[PDB]
């Protein structure tokens, strides 16, 4: 009686599909992998860079069956995209595990389509966690593994010995375009968060803390008289940001997020970068060698139109402008604070309801009959 992954794999492999793509940017052809998240709806997660600029998307199951898929959502910043199989019939979804349980040393199995050979399984271990820096603008909290991964594996599944998805194979560090035992996969939790949004919104509602900062190294710890040799150092907090409202001051060092310790600033950036707007979370700070806990709520970057905030005036006296932004296209068309929209396009405007009722008509050009002072002027749009 010999040990084997076969028993576990025969269960899991149907859940991993291979993706073929045709696009243009000049026609191109690409291929990679995907994982079935919802067998019934036919939801398949994959790397945004596999299905980017795609005109035609076809998915091939493990049994050979082909399907056509349509884009559902995409998030370049995290390199996660979600597609949907058309006419889903008899599919097999994968169970996701909590990536926060992973520990360097845990055994991993990779499943994908290297060089279009077909569904190929390789194994390895968790080399490291919370790796980042491949692209400082992207949200990356990678899992590192020595499991064989090459071009094609992208969007493929990385699972534990129980066949539970722990991550999505994304990139490798290779000087020759060939695996050298260093592969990276996006943690399952981050995929859980990102996809569930795309299902609901078609995109990701991104919430930020509104804080500037950098990696806390031993050097910077010495200068700031700080204990921890690692974490997120707050360079400054933006005014009117959730963090500011929460009581986060510059020079603070963030050490935990919702209880879970923080590996780095880059990691923390990737964490919240995948959480939906309005997500309430808690941080663990360190200021003056004192442990602090704070409750936060993600934030966006009456009625407001085109970067212009307005409201109603008295009782059906038009839509008065409260305050304007200079850099915004609002002030670029003339709009100033204090204006009162009497009407638009020869239609009387008493409130934001009648105003919006004109915008529902979607005219090529919008002519606003506002009034500044005792004068009556017009503003044009488009």
């Amino acid at each position: 009686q010999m040990p084997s992954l076969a028993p576990m794999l025969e269960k899991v492999m149907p859940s991993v599909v291979s993706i073929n793509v045709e696009g243009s940017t000049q026609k191109f052809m690409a291929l990679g992998s995907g994982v079935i998240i919802d067998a019934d709806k036919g939801y398949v997660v994959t790397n945004n860079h596999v299905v980017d600029n795609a005109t035609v998307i076809k998915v091939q199951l493990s049994d050979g069956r082909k399907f056509d898929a349509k884009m559902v959502g995409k998030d370049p910043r995290s390199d996660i995209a979600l597609i949907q199989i058309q006419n889903p019939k008899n599919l097999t979804a994968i169970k996701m595990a909590d990536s926060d349980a992973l520990r360097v040393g845990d055994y991993t199995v990779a499943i994908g389509n290297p060089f279009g050979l077909g569904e190929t399984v390789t194994s390895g271990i968790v080399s490291a966690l919370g790796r980042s820096g491949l692209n400082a603008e992207n949200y990356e909290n990678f899992i590192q593994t020595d499991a064989a991964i090459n071009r094609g594996n992208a969007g493929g599944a990385l699972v534990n010995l129980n066949g539970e998805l722990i991550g999505i194979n994304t990139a490798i560090l290779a000087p020759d375009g060939g695996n050298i035992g260093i592969g990276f996969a996006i943690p399952s939790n981050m995929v859980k968060n990102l996809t569930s949004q795309m299902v609901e919104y078609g995109q990701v509602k991104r919430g930020e803390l509104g804080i500037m900062g950098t990696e806390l190294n031993s050097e910077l710890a010495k200068a700031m008289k700080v204990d921890a040799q690692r974490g997120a150092f707050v360079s400054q907090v933006l005014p009117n940001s959730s963090a500011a409202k929460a009581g986060i001051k510059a020079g603070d060092v963030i050490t935990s997020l919702n209880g879970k310790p923080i590996s780095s600033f880059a990691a923390l950036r990737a964490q919240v970068g995948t959480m939906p707007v309005g997500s309430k979370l808690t941080l663990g700070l360190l200021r003056d060698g004192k442990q602090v806990n704070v409750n936060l709520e993600l934030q966006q970057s009456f009625n407001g139109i085109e970067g212009a905030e307005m409201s109603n005036k008295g009782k059906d006296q038009g839509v008065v402008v409260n305050n304007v932004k200079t850099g915004t296209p609002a002030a670029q068309i003339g709009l100033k604070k204090g204006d009162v929209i009497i009407g638009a396009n020869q239609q009387a405007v008493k409130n934001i309801a009648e105003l919006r009722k004109v915008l529902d008509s979607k005219p090529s050009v919008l002519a606003l009959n506002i009034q500044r002072g005792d004068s009556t002027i017009y503003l044009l749009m488009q």
Binding site: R151, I172, L173, E208, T214, F233, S235, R269
Partner: peptide, 16 residues
Amino acid sequence: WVSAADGSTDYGILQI
């Protein structure tokens, strides 16, 4: 290198 499939040295200032 990696391929798809003044101030502290560790980083410039990123936004979270």
